[PDB]
Design an enzyme around this catalytic site. Structure first.
Site, PDB file in Angstrom:
ATOM      1  N   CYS A  45       0.247 -11.977 -11.310  1.00 11.61           N
ATOM      2  CA  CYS A  45       1.354 -11.497 -11.805  1.00 11.61           C
ATOM      3  C   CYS A  45       2.659 -12.521 -11.749  1.00 11.61           C
ATOM      4  O   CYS A  45       3.495 -12.920 -12.297  1.00 11.61           O
ATOM      5  CB  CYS A  45       2.035 -10.210 -11.207  1.00 11.61           C
ATOM      6  SG  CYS A  45       1.895  -9.955  -9.451  1.00 11.61           S
ATOM      7  N   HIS A 205       5.295  -6.647  -6.888  1.00 18.88           N
ATOM      8  CA  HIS A 205       5.151  -6.986  -8.249  1.00 18.88           C
ATOM      9  C   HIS A 205       5.989  -8.095  -9.116  1.00 18.88           C
ATOM     10  O   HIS A 205       7.243  -7.450  -9.242  1.00 18.88           O
ATOM     11  CB  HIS A 205       4.747  -5.706  -9.334  1.00 18.88           C
ATOM     12  CG  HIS A 205       4.128  -6.162 -10.625  1.00 18.88           C
ATOM     13  ND1 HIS A 205       4.520  -5.439 -11.458  1.00 18.88           N
ATOM     14  CD2 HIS A 205       2.813  -6.705 -10.901  1.00 18.88           C
ATOM     15  CE1 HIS A 205       3.673  -5.874 -12.531  1.00 18.88           C
ATOM     16  NE2 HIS A 205       2.660  -6.589 -12.286  1.00 18.88           N
ATOM     17  N   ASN A 225       6.597  -6.505 -18.857  1.00 17.02           N
ATOM     18  CA  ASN A 225       5.493  -6.215 -17.752  1.00 17.02           C
ATOM     19  C   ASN A 225       4.307  -7.098 -18.170  1.00 17.02           C
ATOM     20  O   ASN A 225       4.348  -7.605 -19.324  1.00 17.02           O
ATOM     21  CB  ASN A 225       5.104  -4.632 -17.728  1.00 17.02           C
ATOM     22  CG  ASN A 225       4.198  -4.431 -16.190  1.00 17.02           C
ATOM     23  OD1 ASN A 225       3.985  -5.653 -15.366  1.00 17.02           O
ATOM     24  ND2 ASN A 225       3.931  -3.283 -16.260  1.00 17.02           N
TER      25      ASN A 225
END
Ligand SMILES: *[C@@H]1O[C@H](CO)[C@@H](O[C@@H]2O[C@H](CO)[C@@H](O)[C@H](O)[C@H]2NC(C)=O)[C@H](O)[C@H]1NC(C)=O
Ligand code: NA
Length: 260
Positions: A45, A205, A225
């Site tokens: 990520c 994240h 995302n």
């Protein structure tokens, strides 16, 4: 933070920012912005959100309309960034973009396929829990070696903190990388404006910030995302803005791509 803090000019600072803003509508001729990534069964990520924003900023600032920056290259080759598929640091990912540079998605395509992150996949992706992926090898030629290596650089990197920085930077220069704490109740988000109310902490994240706005008197960030287009609202989620929800306003990473 290892990066210097962003200072705004006197002109940038006094700009009256709109109550809502969307990067895709601000730069409608930048096709990478509305595209949603899939990091797959890997803790990349930190690298994927960075490469997405760098791709956007080559259009918003760098003068190149449609170049996709290779998350794979960053993931594999920046060993000072973290531990590849086991997590990394957004700040160091942008530092690497200037000091060394990154190839494009075309030179080195993302090595991991689509998979389902929440639950059911309408397109028929396997569960991501089915896969166990190691950090890929750092390559110095394009996967197809006959394609010439083109190296893409930024010329500066900086850090951002707080609601105003985020908004002001986004308004002038477009999407950048932020980070927040994930809790169990976030995983099944599909609508509304997110706010942590229950669930165990899962981990940090990194994500790509693209917009802001207000819904029924509740200010929010619009976020891209990296769990493909089937998660949340078409790949996006809205989160509470103003009071550092899950530490989202604690640290942002950005830089300016150099016209090659
Ligand atoms: C660098 O190239 C290597 C070799 O071509 C890639 O490693 C392979 O990745 C595929 C797809 O994930 C795996 O199925 C193979 O098992 C890997 N082979 C070897 C020998 O490692 C690697 O993915 C490339 N790295 C990047 C960042 O694109
Ligand atoms: Na601020």
């Amino acid at each position: 933070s290892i990066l210097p803090k962003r200072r705004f000019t006197e002109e940038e600072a006094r700009a009256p920012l709109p109550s809502s803003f969307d990067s895709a509508e601000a730069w409608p001729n930048c096709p990478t912005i509305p595209q949603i990534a899939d990091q797959s069964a890997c803790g990349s990520c930190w690298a994927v959100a960075a490469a997405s924003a760098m791709s956007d900023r080559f259009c918003t600032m760098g003068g190149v309309q449609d170049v996709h920056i290779s998350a794979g290259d960053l993931l594999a080759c920046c060993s000072d960034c973290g531990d590849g598929c086991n997590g990394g640091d957004p700040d160091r990912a942008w530092a690497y973009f200037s000091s060394t540079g990154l190839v494009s998605d075309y030179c080195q395509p993302y090595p991991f396929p689509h998979c389902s992150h929440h639950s059911k996949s309408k397109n028929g992706y396997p569960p991501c829990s089915q896969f166990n992926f190691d950090t890929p090898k750092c390559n110095y030629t394009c996967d197809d070696p006959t394609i010439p290596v083109v190296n893409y650089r930024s010329w500066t990197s900086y850090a951002l903190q707080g609601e105003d920085d985020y908004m002001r930077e986004l308004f002038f220069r477009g999407p950048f990388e932020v980070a927040f704490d994930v809790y169990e109740d976030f995983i099944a988000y599909n609508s509304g404006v997110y706010h942590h109310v229950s669930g165990q902490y899962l981990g940090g994240h990194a994500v790509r910030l693209v917009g802001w706005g207000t819904s029924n008197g509740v200010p929010y960030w619009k976020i891209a995302n990296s769990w493909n287009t089937e998660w949340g609202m078409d790949g996006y989620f809205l989160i509470r803005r103003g009071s550092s929800e899950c530490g989202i306003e604690d640290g942002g990473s950005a830089g300016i791509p150099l016209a090659p």
